[PDB]
């Protein structure tokens, strides 16, 4: 009954092509309609292959527009390019002037940082004097600022580095004084030592204008320091081999409110004696998930107490690779929160005190091992950069909701010549009374030096050591860059419907027809 | 005849599903085909709900591309950070040196601005001397530069502020001299007093290169001013509490040719003694209408004689809210063109002259009312910023066709050391003959001071007071950001057609079928 | 048999509308169904006109996203704003001090460049002394730096201009010393004379951080030059009429590795005595072909040995138009590689030596022709800019795959005051031994001057002539802007299918139906 069931199907079905093939007029008619059906099906499949290829590519649609939705005021991190305090540096210069031998200066100072620095210098110097020419590269790394920072307790350095009271002369967010003890947070940098981060107390709307922004006056000069008739250097502290080296000014980093700043990768420089204007144009980027792109809401290596950034993830991935291979952490990269209690690669590993007296081969072997650790870390950093598979293995992706800022950099000398610039001196020393901050028991030396240097007669030259920062929102409207799926499932279904209705002519109520036909064939 | 009409319909209709339900093979067949039809309709409706939700969302499509279509050369507005003329400031300093009492200096000068300033200072001082400690905040606002600008006639300040002849030493657009009297327009700023806007005489194509741009030399230094052995201040004029304060240099704003500049929100700073290069990269943004977005072709609060900007609309909305509530206009925001004849909030409201002799409680009550007005304006400004509904109520939207500029900021000391820098002095004083401009009857004092200060021997130090601005188009091709409707009505119709042809199988020539069926049912 | 064939067609066809028109119930029925068919067809055609208008518009889809794919480290081109060597300039100043007459100084120097310069000055001066007032404009162009560069052999200028050994004190890419003879390439600029381009030796991944970037120290000051008691000028070399003129510092251009820099259109300025930080944010733009946009993979006027840029194409198009009309090439635009051996427009065309003795009318006519050539070139440059058809005729299009860089500009005084800045002097003169480079047979004069100027006691002032550049990648992730076709042929086919299934109801297996019908009509 195959002929009968196919004939009944052809007479009752809605399939637009089958009846002509079944109820053919002649052999040539059946052949033609067969080739028409074949051609329709072939073009159908060829087009659907392209359609499904487009869909499974998972394209993205990106829109850029200006929206009034506000973003939080950026956090400002300031690092003084002079890492140590003026008094400590002057004291060190005077001691090295008085006696060049570091061994004689171990217990000559009341400051713990000076004593530790002298101990380290005395422990390293005899080997330097004996083996400088034989192994110059080893001592080029041992006598470095980062190396000393990794071998001295951070709590000891923090008391000798730049202090907030001696760095931020004045602060003003909007029309109110900054709560200097509530808004400023101190964090440690291997090269800049003490650094300070400003966080505005708080969603809220963003106000425009310089007067509505963040204005601060900082002491960043080095004219207070003693001037030497001949060049003399503090070992380790003065590093001519660094790319920053003897730079004078402030390193300013503009970043979201709850993110770790990275001065050596991002930020801006402000010379002393100039007023820097930072016109901030906010931006927001919204990203979508795995099938269409890559984004992450949290740092894989983090602890979940900081706003996510891709730079932090990449740096922590590099640190993870360094720790895994070399067995130590690089001081130039953040410590892993989940893998604490890891010694720095530049740590001397309890370098013995007896090396101060004899430059024995054992002490040199310890320094050799330190240099080998540094070289291991450096090689791992370079290898991983080219090793793209390692970067992908860390699963570092851009944030799914990122706030970023564009900076309009500008400069202008802050203390004007003549009586125009007297306002700066009156504010710093007459109203804020900057000198009287240091009239304390343990800060008398700084007080006398600032009293002598900043007297009224030398106003024009002395005031050049100060700098002013103005961080203001120049455009309250935020440029939003939102990513979205370009080709959804509904659009895919619509395209499939159009192609089904164009080429083959069948529908879903008509693909039931063939289902009933196959049931009838089964139960024939 | 219901059965007959439905049977005839099923036998003659093209509806792909109904005939199987009507001409059912059996009860199970009718049930199946009914559930197939129901399922098709349900999926149809579920997909069309999503489709219509997408359509009525009115999505936008944004394209970013580089096009050769030119944009007009940007207008350049320059404000000298020294608001007053050198002669006026020196005279004021000398008078305050000679006699500290302002009452004795009312009629001691021939300049009207000096007389008005002395009158205001003498009217405010007795209350300051008596009530400074009791009400410090009130006098912190009364003795302000903005307050004095709002209580002195602008036509009086304009003659004492910085003049164009004494500010723009030289100008050159392309290879031709700037028409200094045709291209420069003076406008008043509450803090910078006199400011000047350059408008190029003119669509036209944009030329690249520094030599094809706008080059000008300006006198912005303050070394000409007298240097005092002790700090003495001009009340109101010197404001240590401002975020700009004693800054020295030029405030440069780059904006479209026919727009009001806003130096305190946008612009760049140029220190004296440096050559500033402003590499301009033009941009154009095209936006579309209400159903898909928000854009406006004209400022709602404006008069229609200026190119539209969103910043102007927002500032005028803030001014409108201030005037409505406090009954006065803030001097820090533009005056409303449609609501002229409104006194500033900082206006003293005809403060009597008798206060110069007695510090009576009545005079203090008038100052108290002035302070209350200032505080009302400040509170309204802060409240409206958080009050997002007010911002929406002003109907401020970004322009539908906006031209914007990106600035590449750079600096370099303009007068080179040695004979290299002699070209600057030769141009300023040998060819332009800058000193001989001031050899007039009412400008002799300035002429002598410039003759003494800018002599040949002191060339190296004296020339540091000048600055040079170079504004040039760095990329003649414009980055265009055009917004367009992503999902048009035709695309919606195509998607509806695809879905109709996929799920239900009906068409419009087939939805006539049911129309005839219902007519037949009516006329049965 | 027309009625029979149409009836059989209507009874057997799947066309959803024709059977109702053919097998009409009544006259009103036939009329209605005819108008329904007409309406369906009309709406169909109206929608397809819009669809085809959208398709043949060839719209583009642009996506902006952040990707980890690296781009090559940018090439850095540095031009000293002091074009000539210190020794040559000092010698010229001394000779013009000793004797003002240029004719007496023809053979007084051993340097070939000085002799050629004196010959040119002596050939031009007698006409200048006689006809300065009559034709000031002619001599304003003849006595120009560009004019002298076009009339003196480049190989002669290169030996007298700034040398690499006396310009780049130190270089460091990543942690390694730059191969100063392999990575630096010298190229000639008409205004800056000798300029140098740095190309990193090498796809490769991009490393972040200042210490991983390019750090260099350059001598760019002019304090070494003799200071004159009175203003005296070198004719042609000192050009007060230029927009750059007496600027002191370095012109820094950041561009892709294999592209010609254009300092006068792109770049940044760095003053001496400051450390410039160039935070590089890379970008990549991908563009598509003729039907959807315009892009080119190679410069039409180029030789195919340089990475394509639109700026180069536009400049070479301008040069092509200048050469075609004026018969000469402008020195301010690149020479056409395919049309070499073309004299500059500013070339004096073998100006005779006899003019040194007599200011005859013939010599003035030659200078007049030179001025006419310059004016022709200038007029052609201006005319072509407005002549948009010429710009289109050159077929200059943006590159199909372009790499661009965004620069974060910052400054900070490099040599710190006091012992902090001793590192810079120790590096320059103690380790690099900058003075000892010039202790050669033909450079003794420079050696003595640098020995005297850079002594230890004058460390603070003398070191201000140096500058430091730090070019580092601030964001290793690249912002990609890719253009793609928005409306493909497959989408067009899907929309046609949806519209065919919505309005008219026909398919392709049903447009065969009418093909068989017309065959039957033919063979009736
Ligand atoms: C800066 O902020 C701190 C912390 O909020 C303020 O100190 C607190 O003040 C409140 C009263 O306002 C007290 O109850 C707390 O005991 C104080 N200490 C702490 C640790 O919270 C301080 O007053 C603020 N300074 C200014 C000038 O407002
Ligand atoms: C999201 O990130 C993953 C990272 O694994 C991407 O997958 C990699 O894609 C590259 C090519 O771009 C391949 O070479 C790798 O082999 C892929 N990884 C693996 C594990 O196979 C993925 O393509 C990214 N998604 C999007 C949309 O870009
Ligand atoms: C600067 O522009 C002004 C205004 O166009 C010029 O002054 C006019 O010059 C024309 C002739 O060119 C006269 O008919 C007008 O009477 C002048 N005055 C005004 C108010 O239009 C002036 O000549 C231009 N300066 C230069 C140097 O070209
Ligand atoms: C155009 O602006 C209007 C401003 O009224 C927007 O409508 C407001 O939308 C916000 C949410 O974004 C609501 O909270 C407000 O209640 C809306 N206003 C009113 C009066 O109801 C509108 O959404 C904007 N259009 C687009 C496309 O963004
Ligand atoms: C800088 O690069 C040049 C060119 O590669 C080096 O000179 C070549 O060195 C190789 C051996 O490494 C020799 O075979 C070639 O003969 C040298 N000359 C040339 C022209 O290739 C030079 O050694 C490099 N300098 C440094 C410090 O590495
Ligand atoms: C690619 O460039 C060509 C340049 O010829 C463009 O064609 C020109 O378009 C303008 C309008 O924008 C017309 O005025 C010209 O007449 C056109 N040229 C010719 C020879 O007719 C073309 O439009 C560009 N393509 C795209 C997609 O922008
Ligand atoms: C690159 O990375 C993969 C996976 O991290 C690793 O297996 C491979 O050894 C690496 N190659 C090199 C040369 O380090
Ligand atoms: C500093 O402190 C001492 C002791 O408290 C006091 O006598 C002296 O007046 C103070 N000096 C200043 C400037 O405050
Ligand atoms: C201010 O200090 C300087 C330091 O050099 C000194 O020369 C000058 O005499 C001092 N002035 C007064 C008034 O003490
Ligand atoms: C916010 O704005 C709305 C409308 O402008 C107003 O009714 C409301 O009172 C405002 N709220 C505050 C706290 O000012
Ligand atoms: C200034 O003007 C007076 C009177 O017109 C004249 O005698 C004198 O020479 C002028 N000085 C200069 C420098 O032009
Ligand atoms: C130039 O002015 C300065 C001002 O201090 C003065 O010392 C110098 O003697 C003057 N030179 C001449 C030549 O008048
Ligand atoms: C503009 O360009 C076209 C084609 O290059 C040319 O025919 C025409 O003459 C030009 N017009 C002018 C005013 O130069
Ligand atoms: C300069 O060269 C000469 C001759 O070679 C030598 O005597 C002298 O010591 C050199 N000076 C320096 C500073 O190297
Ligand atoms: C250094 O050079 C300066 C140049 O003015 C000179 O005054 C000084 O005496 C020199 N110092 C030494 C130690 O030669």
Author numbering:
A (entry chain C), B (entry chain A), C (entry chain B): 2 to 203, 208 to 529
The authors write:
We solved high-resolution structures of FaNaC1 alone, with full agonist FMRFa, with partial agonist ASSFVRIa, and with both FMRFa and pore-blocker diminazene, identifying the ligand-binding site and elucidating the conformational changes induced by ligand binding. Each subunit comprises a minimal N terminus and a nonresolved 63-amino acid C terminus facing the intracellular side, two transmembrane segments (TM1 and TM2), and a large extracellular domain.
For both structures, density could be unambiguously assigned to amino acid sequence based on mostly continuous main chain density and numerous distinctive side chain densities. The 63-amino-acid C-terminal tail was not resolved. To establish how ligand binding induces channel gating, we compared ligand-free and ligand-bound FaNaC1 structures. In both ligand-bound structures, however, the channel pore appears closed, with radii of ~1 Å at the level of G503 and G506 in TM2a (G3′ and G6′ in a TM2 numbering scheme). This is similar to our ligand-free, inactive FaNaC1 structure and is too narrow to pass even mostly dehydrated Na+ ions (~2.3 Å). This involves, for example, L211 displacing 20 Å and is a notable exception to the otherwise immobile palm/ball domain. Thus, the H297S mutation increases gating efficacy. This suggests that WT resting FaNaC1 channels are energetically primed for opening but cannot do so until ligand binding and extracellular domain rolling releases TM1/TM2a via outward H297 movement.
